[PDB]
């Protein structure tokens, strides 16, 4: 069975759950970001709270695509995880059989192509609040294998009417369809405590995005109007339609044309077009960008930048507060999700027996922080000459150097 | 005024005497009256649609 | 297929197989609606824009409608023999066979 | 007498209710209303 | 809901869809009981207080 | 039946009396008869076409 105890039947693993839903694969995103107003955004969020996640997912995708600063921040945050070395470790004080199981799982993950793509797809749940990856199960003889990992759009799911924390497929029915066991890797990182609909970071970031969009569009319009002044022509009674058209064309082309002549009975008045500055717009854009930076990566390095300054402890100063905390949180949550969803089916299908769930191996990301070799290498000799018996295992582990074999 | 005529010398579906035809360009877009019957009369512009308001 | 075993090997009688065929045309089916470009963007409540998924589900349902419309017309439509699919005069032989 | 046949598994439930606000408790305890100083010792 | 998928011969009818917006207001309800302040404390069986 | 008239809003080539004018909306699309002359008849649907069966 799975970790949650639901019965597992190997018959349903031959075909993906969504195969019998050919309607989903033919859908196109509705792009709800175009022509978006604060009222529309509020309605979208409220409806999403009630189980209509399609519009929210499409809006989040558009928001990711249309904002360069937000996209850069999210990409940097995800690439931070994608570059971490990982390993599979056996449970606490594991036995020989458990160690062998962990070693086999580690070897299987090393030789499993598409792991990086799986991690990238799973990390989308950081912003979207939940990411679902469908599994393709195949048999190369007697051992089950994940053939491929398919990322399904968040717009394909909904909320259970009887449960606000349980996701279901959109199968044209009011209650949707329950997710098949062992058929998905659902990643639901928890930045804030609440239901799945409210758990996305883009829900926090939506309003600054709209503020920045409005400011940028208004600035573009004002830059378009800038330049020549608006000038209005006046004509006396008894001016025919042809003369009216001639005066109109003359006024229209007068800005580009340096000189022109009109009868003394006519008049042209040059009125202010748009006089001001870009200061308000740019102030709003900077405020929104700082808010986005703080919300995504913390207000110590991105928005209120940590500035330059090297040194042996500079790495620690830059990392440990804020950056290390965020990195560790994301890595730990991703590792927990993976150990729950991918490691367990492999252990319970590819190996004999029914090992207890509490003793399953856990995927661990390498969060080791580079320690100053020079300072500590200076420090040891004094301590050892004093008489302290420092274990070599601690040194080898903390320095990153492996133990002799 | 008239919101739209959508005539293009073609009605959507002018069904009379038990037979449904396509002619006389009787396309309207308004809820002045007979909206329920306006659904039946309209909702089938087989050919192209050209909207030229008569400002009625 | 092959007919019954006859009762004479003396002066055997030859026979022939009957080549049967059934022809059908796969004409298309469609349905669509018109909407305004501004209204879909000028709609913050999520309606008027589920049109894509609604049309997808309608299309997915369509094959059942096609099959059962043909089933309804079975009393009217003709099978390969040349009579109605559900008719009382199916020409299986110079005799008369019926299925209605 | 008083029958009704309804679906239950549909995306909509018949005769849907509306819990617009919770069962808020309204009380009249002491120096919060005038019923208890410029009046009898009444509480609602 | 969409119109039924019809047959195709020469051209496509650009059909339309209806709407049946339903309006219903809200009503307010209340129930209150007036009690004497002194009486709720002037009890020994723990009654007239849970009311 | 007439699967397609190919007439509405389009005008095709019609070679008659040595001069090939364009009118009368004689468009058709079928393999009934005069198939070879169908090319000459449909040699100039210069204008936009809009099919509609006559169910002949």
DSSP A70-95: HHHHHHHHHHHHHT--EEEE--TT--
Alpha carbons A222 and A216: distance in angstroms, whole number: 10
Task: Report residue C43 CA to chain centroid gap.
Answer: 42
Its sign, for the CA torsion A196, A198, A204, A206, is positive
Residue A263, burial from CB neighbour count under 10 angstroms (0-12, 13-18, 19+): exposed
Strands (E), C1-100: 29-30, 32-33
Tokens of B24: 């006389």
Count the alpha carbons within 13 Å of B5 in the hemisphere toward its beta carbon.
15
Contact call for C45 and A28, based on CB within 8 A: no
Alpha carbons A141 and A149: distance in angstroms, whole number: 20
Per DSSP, the three-state class of D22 is: coil
Q: How many Å from the N-terminal Cα to the C-terminal Cα in chain E? A: 52
Candidates C31, C53, C56, C65, partner chain E, best to mutate (most E CBs within 10 A):
C31
The angle subtended at Cα A33 by Cα A31 and Cα A39, nearest 5°, is: 130
Asked if residue F9 lies in contact with residue F48, where contact means CB atoms within 8 angstroms, the answer is yes
Q: Decide the pairing of beta strands E14-15 and E6-7.
A: unpaired
Method: cryo-EM
Per DSSP, the three-state class of A80 is: helix
Candidates F8, F25, F51, F54, partner chain B, best to mutate (most B CBs within 10 A):
F8
- From A52, which residue of chain C is nearest by alpha-carbon distance? C46
Resolution (A): 8.0
Which chains touch F (3+ CB pairs under 8 A)?
B, E
Task: Residue A162: name the closest of F20, E10, D11 by CA.
Answer: D11
Per DSSP, the three-state class of A278 is: coil
Residue A381, burial from CB neighbour count under 10 angstroms (0-12, 13-18, 19+): exposed
User: Residue A43: its chain C contacts at CB < 8 A?
Assistant: 44-46
- From D30, which residue of chain E is nearest by alpha-carbon distance? E37
Q: Flag whether residue C94 sits within 8 Å of chain A, measured between CB atoms.
A: no
Alpha carbons A200 and A192: distance in angstroms, whole number: 8
Alpha carbons F50 and F52: distance in angstroms, whole number: 7
Asked if residue A119 lies in contact with residue A85, where contact means CB atoms within 8 angstroms, the answer is no
Looking at residue A248, the DSSP 8-state letter turns out to be H
Asked if residue A164 lies in contact with residue A158, where contact means CB atoms within 8 angstroms, the answer is no
For C84, phi and psi rounded to 5 degrees?
Answer: -60, 145
Task: Report residue D39 CA to chain centroid gap.
Answer: 27
Asked if residue A104 lies in contact with residue A351, where contact means CB atoms within 8 angstroms, the answer is yes
Residue F17 distance to chain B (closest CA, Å): 32
Task: Residue A134: name the closest of A72, A183, A187 by CA.
Answer: A183
Residues 6+ apart with CB under 8 A from A324: A367, A369
Give chain C's radius of gyration (CA, Å).
26
Contact call for F9 and B48, based on CB within 8 A: yes
Tokens of D31: 């120096």
Task: Residue E9: name the closest of C63, C27, F9, C65 by CA.
Answer: C27
Which chains touch B (3+ CB pairs under 8 A)?
E, F
Do the chains A and B touch each other, judged by at least 3 C-beta pairs below 8 angstroms? no
Per DSSP, the three-state class of A199 is: helix
Task: Residue A350: name the closest of A75, A144, A55 by CA.
Answer: A144
Task: Residue A364: name the closest of A111, A84, A101 by CA.
Answer: A84
φ/ψ bin of B8: left (φ > 0), alpha (ψ from -120 to 50), beta (otherwise): left
- From A36, which residue of chain C is nearest by alpha-carbon distance? C41
Task: Residue A126: name the closest of A187, A65, A72, A73 by CA.
Answer: A187
Do the chains B and F touch each other, judged by at least 3 C-beta pairs below 8 angstroms? yes
Looking at residue E14, the DSSP 8-state letter turns out to be E
Strand partners, F21: F14
Contact call for C32 and E9, based on CB within 8 A: no
Residue B56 distance to chain E (closest CA, Å): 24
Task: Residue A298: name the closest of A333, A325, A328 by CA.
Answer: A325
Of E26, E35, E40, the CB nearest to D20: E26
Tokens of F33: 């008869």
Task: Residue A351: name the closest of A136, A108, A109, A101 by CA.
Answer: A101
Asked if residue A23 lies in contact with residue A11, where contact means CB atoms within 8 angstroms, the answer is no
Contact call for A173 and D11, based on CB within 8 A: yes
How many CB atoms are closer than 10 A to CB C83? 17
How many CB atoms are closer than 10 A to CB E15? 20
Task: Residue A80: name the closest of A262, A324, A353 by CA.
Answer: A324
The angle subtended at Cα D24 by Cα D21 and Cα D25, nearest 5°, is: 165
Alpha carbons C64 and C47: distance in angstroms, whole number: 27
User: Residue B48: its chain F contacts at CB < 8 A?
Assistant: 9, 50
Contact call for A30 and C49, based on CB within 8 A: yes
Q: Flag whether residue C56 sits within 8 Å of chain A, measured between CB atoms.
A: yes
Task: Residue C51: name the closest of A190, E48, A187, A30 by CA.
Answer: A30
For A172, phi and psi rounded to 5 degrees?
Answer: 70, 0
Task: Residue C100: name the closest of C84, C87, C81 by CA.
Answer: C87
Q: What is the DSSP code string of C40-62?
A: HHS-TTS-SS-HHHHHHHHHHHH
Alpha carbons C46 and A244: distance in angstroms, whole number: 49
Per DSSP, the three-state class of A99 is: helix
Residue D39 distance to chain A (closest CA, Å): 47
Strand partners, A225: none
Asked if residue A282 lies in contact with residue A223, where contact means CB atoms within 8 angstroms, the answer is no
Tokens of A70: 């937000």
Give chain B's radius of gyration (CA, Å).
11
Residue D7 distance to chain A (closest CA, Å): 12
Alpha carbons B6 and B42: distance in angstroms, whole number: 10
Task: Residue E15: name the closest of F19, A52, A371, B45 by CA.
Answer: B45
Tokens of A289: 């960008």
Strand partners, A168: A158, A178
Task: Residue A295: name the closest of A264, A331, A334, A322 by CA.
Answer: A322
Alpha carbons B45 and B26: distance in angstroms, whole number: 11
Q: Decide the pairing of beta strands A144-152 and A86-89.
A: unpaired
Contact call for C29 and E17, based on CB within 8 A: no
Asked if residue A102 lies in contact with residue A87, where contact means CB atoms within 8 angstroms, the answer is no
Residue F5, burial from CB neighbour count under 10 angstroms (0-12, 13-18, 19+): buried
How many CB atoms are closer than 10 A to CB F51? 19
Alpha carbons A174 and A358: distance in angstroms, whole number: 37
Per DSSP, the three-state class of A36 is: coil
Asked if residue A133 lies in contact with residue A142, where contact means CB atoms within 8 angstroms, the answer is no
């Amino acid at each position: 069975v799975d970790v949650y105890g639901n019965p597992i039947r190997t018959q349903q693993l031959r075909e993906p759950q969504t195969s019998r839903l050919a309607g989903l694969a033919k859908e196109f995103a509705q792009h709800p970001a175009k022509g978006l107003t604060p009222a529309k955004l509020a309605r979208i969020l409220v409806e999403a709270e009630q189980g209509n996640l399609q519009a929210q997912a499409e809006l989040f995708m558009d928001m990711e695509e249309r904002d360069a600063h937000l996209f850069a921040e999210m990409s940097k945050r995800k690439r931070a995880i994608l570059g971490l070395d990982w390993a599979v470790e056996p449970p606490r004080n594991a036995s020989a059989a458990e160690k062998a199981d962990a070693d086999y799982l580690h070897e299987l993950l090393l030789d499993l192509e598409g792991l990086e793509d799986l991690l990238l797809d799973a990390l989308d749940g950081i912003g979207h609040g939940y990411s679902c990856i469908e599994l393709e199960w195949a048999l190369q003889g007697r051992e089950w294998m994940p053939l491929a990992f398919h990322h399904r759009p968040q717009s394909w799911f909904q909320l259970n009417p009887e449960d606000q924390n349980e996701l279901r497929l959109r199968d044209n029915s009011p209650a949707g369809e329950a997710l098949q066991p062992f058929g998905w890797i659902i990643h639901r990182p928890r930045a804030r405590s609440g239901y799945v609909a409210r758990s996305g970071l883009f829900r926090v970031l939506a309003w600054p995005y709209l503020f920045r969009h409005y400011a940028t569009s208004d600035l573009a319009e004002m830059l378009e109007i800038y330049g020549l002044p608006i000038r209005l022509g006046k004509y006396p009674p008894g001016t025919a339609d042809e003369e009216k058209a001639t005066l109109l064309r003359a006024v229209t082309g007068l800005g580009h044309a340096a000189a022109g002549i009109i009868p003394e009975t006519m008049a042209i008045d040059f009125q202010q077009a748009a006089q001001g500055s870009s200061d308000p717009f740019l102030a709003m854009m900077r405020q929104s960008e700082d808010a986005i930076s703080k919300a995504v990566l913390g207000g110590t390095l991105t928005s209120t930048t940590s500035q330059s300054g090297g040194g042996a402890f500079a790495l620690g100063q830059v990392h440990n507060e804020v950056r290390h905390d965020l990195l560790a949180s994301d890595a730990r949550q991703l590792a927990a999700t993976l150990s729950r969803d991918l490691l367990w089916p492999l252990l319970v299908l590819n190996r004999p027996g029914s090992p207890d769930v509490r003793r399953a191996p856990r995927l661990v990301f390498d969060l080791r922080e580079q320690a100053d070799i020079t300072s500590m290498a200076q420090s040891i000799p004094a301590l050892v000459n004093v008489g302290l018996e420092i274990p070599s295992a601690w040194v080898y582990d903390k320095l990153g150097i492996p133990q002799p074999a | 005024e008239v919101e739209g005529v959508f005539v293009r010398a073609t009605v959507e579906r002018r069904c009379r005497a038990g037979f449904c035809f396509d002619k006389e360009g009787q396309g309207f877009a308004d809820g002045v009256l007979s909206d329920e019957q306006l659904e039946a009369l309209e909702s089938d512009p087989l050919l192209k649609v050209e909207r030229c308001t008569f400002s009625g | 297929q092959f007919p019954k075993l006859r009762e004479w090997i003396g002066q055997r009688v030859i026979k022939d197989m009957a080549a049967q065929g059934y022809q059908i045309t796969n004409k298309l089916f469609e349905s669509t609606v018109g909407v305004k470009r501004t209204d879909i963007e000028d709609d913050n409540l999520g309606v008027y824009g589920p049109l894509m998924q609604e049309m997808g589900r309608a299309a997915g349902a369509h094959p059942d409608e096609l099959v059962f419309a043909l089933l309804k017309a079975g009393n009217a439509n003709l099978c390969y023999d040349g009579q109605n699919f559900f008719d009382t005069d199916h020409p299986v032989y110079p005799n008369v066979d019926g299925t209605g | 007498f008083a029958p009704a046949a309804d679906p239950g598994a549909a995306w909509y439930l018949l005769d849907t209710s509306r819990s617009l606000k919770p069962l808020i408790y309204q009380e009249r305890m002491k120096p919060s209303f005038t019923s208890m100083t410029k009046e009898d010792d009444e509480q609602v």
